[PDB]
Each structure stands twice: as structure tokens, then as C-alpha cells.
Design a protein around this ligand. Structure first.
Ligand SMILES: Nc1ccn([C@@H]2O[C@H](COP(=O)(O)OP(=O)(O)OP(=O)(O)O)[C@@H](O)[C@H]2O)c(=O)n1
Ligand SMILES: [Mn+2]
Ligand SMILES: [Mn+2]
Ligand SMILES: [Mn+2]
Length: 321
């Protein structure tokens, strides 16, 4: 019910204050605090993002919510507690992790992502699916980014919410990320209401390239104008910012912004040039990809950019489309 949803949100927003105190003030939170500061998190940024620490006692969140008169079973359904099968008892889901509040589109905290700081697995532990937290709908930083997304008429999608935080601080405001999932149809519906321009800047590795192709193709099929920023090998935005600085980052992100079709064929370049079977199939694919582009201006430019990869003229490629 809406009433239960509100209770669950309250739990999240109240425990946030305690997590923040635990991180910034308490003895147990000192190592986690140092880890964050070594990653460039200022005291102001930590406060701004509401970042906290979950102690390792396994009943920190439990005792707090109990004291505040919240229904324990509801706290479990809210994804803040876990439950033992045998003893039927409840305990903290998040233990010895740095706590990143996850806000919904309306700016309310509806979940957490807990990162290890001691090399534990899993690296990130998120809230489970709950009535208020749904990964297929939530986009990290959306409530904060919405204003700049509309004004710049563009959204930039990153892989990690950590990259989003750093990019935001660096000056790139129109950035969001999924919570470790593939962009969903619901996400695209939400995004379409804000802008028709979407830029993908995933990690500069093989997995990142693959995710870019899959996500880009989906977006293109749904009628969005898709662009790609290719990061240097082995780097994500956070690592780029840390190595080159904020000014270098904001310059980089507005430099080589390529239409999806152009990025795609550049990836397939060698296979096309060596494998004749792949040559034919990818010529048909890219023809189809270009035909999907709503922007006639960018469609024409894509034809000019893609054609040389197949050793054909722009006119020959245009005919195939
Ligand atoms: N055990 C994990 C690790 C990763 N992810 C998700 O996958 C995204 C991208 O993966 P990764 O590249 O590892 O994120 P980073 O920002 O690089 O994490 P970090 O800088 O803290 O190492 C993360 O934002 C996280 O939400 C996850 O759901 N569960
Ligand atoms: Mn990766
Ligand atoms: Mn990364
Ligand atoms: Mn990273």
C-alpha cells in the first residue's frame, strides 16, 4: 500500500542519518572514511551524497528501526534486513560496507548500494527488489540530473553510479546509471520523456564495448539518437578524472562523440576487412542501423562515415539502405 511504501521510505531516510554519523564520527567508521578520502571524496561531497557506513555488528540497523517503533517484518520487506531460515530471526543486510543512498525519480531514498572497502565479495551489495526499489525503473542520479538533461537536451549513461558521482563533481551534470543492470524498456520510456539524445560512455574494456553495442542497438531500435564516447583502454570516467583532471575530462567528453553506427563499424573494422562473410552481414546490419536513424542530418553523415569501412561509395551505401 502507499502507506507501507511511505514507512519503508522513512526507514531509509532515518537510517541514512545514522549511517552518515557512523562513517564520519565513529571509531569503527575510520577505515571506511579514509578509503573514501583517498578516492578524492571531500567531506562536502560525502555530506552532499549522504554517504555513510554500516557497522559489522549485524544488528545496528535492526536495533535502530526497532527502537523507532518500525515493524521488523516491514523492514525486511524494505530490504534493510535479512532473515535466517532456521531461527526465523532478522539481522542487518548491510554489514561493514560504505553506504550509498539510492534516491528515486522524486528524490526520496528507496534503497542502498553497499560497497566493500576491504576487497570483499560482492564488491557492491544493493537492496533487493522491493515495492519501492525496482532496478528496471531506477536510474541513479536522475532527480538531480533531470534539470540539466532537459536544458542540454541530452542524457549521458555511465556504467557505475560511482562514475556518475565523480562526473557530476567534475562538471558533467546530465549523467545517470543503472544499478548494475542492462538498460530496460521502462528506463527508455522514462528517458524519452526528457530527451531524444543519449550518449553512452561505458568502461573502456571489452565488456564495456559489448554493453555499448547491445544498449545502443536497443536505443536505436526504440528511435533515440544514440552517441558513443569511447574511453581510453582500461579506464572508466572515475579513473580518467583521477588521472587527467576535471578540465581534461569535460574536454574529452565533448570531443569524439560519434553516432552509434559510426562507433559500431569502427569496432567491426578488422573483421569486415578480413572476413568476407562478415563483410556482407555487417554491411546489411549497418544499412539497417542507418535506416533506423530518425535524424536525416545524422543519417546522411553516418552514410558518409560508414561507407569507407566497406570500400564503397556513400551513394552505393545509400542505395543499399
Ligand atoms: N558486485 C557488484 C559489482 C558491480 N556491480 C555494479 O556494476 C557497476 C559497474 O561495475 P564496476 O566497473 O565494477 O563499477 P566501478 O565504478 O568501477 O566500481 P569501483 O570504482 O568502486 O571499483 C557498478 O556501479 C555496480 O553497481 C554490482 O551490481 N555488483
Ligand atoms: Mn567491467
Ligand atoms: Mn568501472
Ligand atoms: Mn571505477
Amino acid at each position: 500500500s502507499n502507506a507501507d511504501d511511505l514507512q519503508m521510505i522513512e526507514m531509509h531516510e532515518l537510517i541514512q542519518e545514522f549511517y552518515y554519523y557512523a562513517l564520519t564520527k565513529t571509531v569503527e567508521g575510520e577505515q571506511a572514511l579514509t578509503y573514501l578520502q583517498e578516492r578524492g571524496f571531500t567531506d562536502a561531497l560525502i555530506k552532499e551524497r549522504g554517504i555513510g557506513f554500516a557497522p559489522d555488528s549485524s544488528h545496528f540497523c535492526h536495533d535502530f528501526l526497532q527502537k523507532k517503533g518500525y515493524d521488523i517484518e516491514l523492514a525486511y520487506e524494505a530490504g534493510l534486513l535479512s532473515r535466517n531460515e532456521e531461527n526465523f530471526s532478522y539481522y542487518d543486510r548491510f554489514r561493514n560496507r560504505i553506504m550509498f543512498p539510492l534516491k528515486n525519480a522524486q528524490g526520496r531514498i528507496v534503497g542502498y548500494s553497499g560497497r566493500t572497502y576491504t576487497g570483499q565479495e560482492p564488491k557492491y551489495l544493493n537492496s533487493p527488489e522491493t515495492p519501492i526499489f525496482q532496478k528496471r525503473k531506477l536510474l541513479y542520479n536522475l532527480d538531480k540530473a533531470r534539470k540539466s538533461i532537459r536544458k542540454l537536451d541530452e542524457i549521458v549513461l555511465l556504467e557505475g553510479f560511482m562514475d556518475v558521482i565523480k562526473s557530476d563533481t567534475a562538471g558533467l551534470k546530465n549523467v545517470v546509471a543503472t544499478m548494475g543492470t542492462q538498460l530496460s524498456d521502462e528506463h527508455i520510456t522514462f528517458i524519452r520523456k526528457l530527451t531524444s539524445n543519449i550518449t553512452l560512455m561505458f568502461d573502456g574494456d571489452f565488456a564495456g564495448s559489448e554493453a555499448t553495442l547491445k544498449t545502443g542497438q536497443h536505443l536505436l531500435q526504440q528511435g533515440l539518437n544514440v552517441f558513443v564516447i569511447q574511453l581510453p583502454s582500461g579506464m572508466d570516467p572515475d579513473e580518467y578524472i583521477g588521472k587527467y583532471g576535471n578540465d581534461a575530462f569535460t574536454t574529452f567528453v565533448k570531443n569524439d562523440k560519434k553516432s552509434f553506427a559510426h562507433y559500431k563499424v569502427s569496432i567491426l573494422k578488422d573483421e569486415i576487412a578480413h572476413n568476407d562473410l562478415s563483410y556482407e552481414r555487417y554491411l546489411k546490419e549497418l544499412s539497417h542501423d542507418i535506416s533506423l536513424m530518425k535524424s536525416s542530418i545524422l543519417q546522411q553523415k553516418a552514410i558518409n562515415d560508414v561507407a569507407p569501412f566497406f570500400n564503397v561509395s556513400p551513394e552505393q551505401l545509400a542505395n543499399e539502405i
